[PDB]
């Protein structure tokens with residue numbers, strides 16, 4: 001089985017890592033639109049066209065399924081992409097909704113959605129959760145987390161101050177935190193730590209990881225038993241910084 | 256004269272404002288490639304191509320001269336753009352070098368260049384300054400300044416912490432600081448306040464503004480109001496910003 005993975009850049013690596021461990025596919029074609037990253041600060045119209053152009057990139061690769069690892073693209077371009085695509089396209093939003101549905105029985109549990117400005121503004125998460133019966137939903141566009149993470153500021157006073165900037169205004173004790181952005185898993189522990197040290201939470205909140213969530217979904221939906229190639233063929237492509245992207249793949253994914 | 260102004264997005268407003276105040280042109284065609292901003296975080300080969308493509312946008316407008324308000328595009332794509340352009344293309348780097356020549360007589364004056372990662376790695380300013388005889392040139396990529404400014408983090412603890420993160424490691428105290436990025440003028444007084452508050456200085460460092468520098472050059476070189484906005488991203492948003500901040 002040969003599939004594709006699309007993201008605005010290298011961020012999607014966080015989703016790809018999960019996919020690789022789950023041995024769901026024998027071959028993966030990763031494509032990052034690095035020349036235009038980030039997507040999170042842009043509008044729906046622009047994002048949708050980006051999504052459509054991504055489909056064009058994959059046509060020669062003859063993939064049988066496309067994973068939109070980008071949360072922003074999943075929120076703004078997924079519907080349009082699915083409209084014209086002949087192969088199934090799976091985003092990272094619905095899988096997380098289902099993940100929450102399975103592990104969060106209390107419909108009143110306070111849920112906090114974190115993502116880019118575009119993702120949050122879209123209310124993609126909020127709407128899906130409401131449809132599933134959840135009644136305590138809060139969202140925050142922690143936009144600066146993206147560039148900080150890209151500069152590798154994964155700890156220290158600057159990150160702490162940035163988290164403080166976004167989280168201080170919160171008047172809820174989150175029991176569930178959605179890491180609704182490809183970049184957020186890289187500071188998940190820091191985020192959990194902030195809430196445990198700045199709030200009176202009795203126990204750490206449940207963190208929803210987009211990659212683990214989509215893995216769960218794919219296994220069930222497509223009846224995949226984790227028996228694909230052990231050392232799968234993976235290609236990395238991008239609209240820019242491709243040499244760099246390949247280096248990142250070897251350095252962090254050992255591919 | 257009818258001219259064009261190019262930037263990766265809305266940032267070029269810092270230059271457009273200077274142009275407008277100087278009442279130099281009868282008509283201006285502003286284009287921000289907001290679908291792909293930022294340029295500063297990307298590699299040179301990508302930025303150069305972005306610049307060439309920008310030229311195509313202005314062709315039907317029949318502009319007489321093009322201003323590249325973007326410091327990053329000025330640093331990386333200007334040479335290539337001028338190669339394939341018949342109309343003059345003026346960037347924001349050389350004009351600043353000239354201003355510095357006029358305002359900084361002391362060749363040993365410590366000069367600090369601030370800009371995007373791409374602009375700083377190009378050594379555009381350093382090379383130009385070296386060529387003109389300056390002996391104490393420093394540079395620093397204050398990358399996070401761009402997104403902080405776009406999110407309107409123009410004061411407070413977060414900006415202070417970010418400036419500290421970038422400035423603390425400096426060993427040389429600048430007497431002159433070049434705001435080599437469209438966004439930096441929005442935190443000019445804060446950058447000024449940082450050095451005045453962290454060191455004992457009788458007078459703040461001289462800040463060089465890209466917009467003011469290019470206005471002087473244009474008046475000089477060209478012995479020198481309809482304004483329309485275009486964008487690869489949300490043009491309506493850009494026009495709304497123009498109405499709010501430029502009253503246009």
Ligand SMILES: CC(C)Cn1c(=O)n(C)c(=O)c2c(-c3ccncc3)n(Cc3cccc4ccccc34)nc21
Nearest residue numbers: 010011012013014017149150151152182183186248252
């Ligand atoms: C699959 C990842 C969990 C692996 N990984 C890290 O574990 N860790 C710990 C990483 O640090 C890492 C990095 C990394 C490399 C250089 N600078 C910042 C991050 N990168 C590349 C990278 C680059 C930019 C943004 C990214 C956003 C989301 C995932 C990866 C990103 N990958 C990293």
Ligand SMILES: CC(C)Cn1c(=O)n(C)c(=O)c2c(-c3ccncc3)n(Cc3cccc4ccccc34)nc21
Nearest residue numbers: 265266267268269272404405406407437438441496500
């Ligand atoms: C720079 C001045 C001509 C106008 N101006 C402000 O004075 N001031 C004080 C502004 O705040 C300003 C703003 C602004 C609007 C919304 N959020 C942040 C900044 N904007 C729009 C804007 C947006 C993003 C990045 C920009 C980078 C450089 C210049 C302007 C930018 N313009 C602002």
Ligand SMILES: N[C@H](CCC(=O)O)C(=O)O
Nearest residue numbers: 008038039040071072182
């Ligand atoms: N990939 C984006 C983050 C980076 C961007 O804004 O392009 C997301 O998951 O929302």
Ligand SMILES: N[C@H](CCC(=O)O)C(=O)O
Nearest residue numbers: 263293294295326327437
């Ligand atoms: N216009 C850029 C800043 C924004 C970007 O990186 O594109 C500059 O002047 O360097």
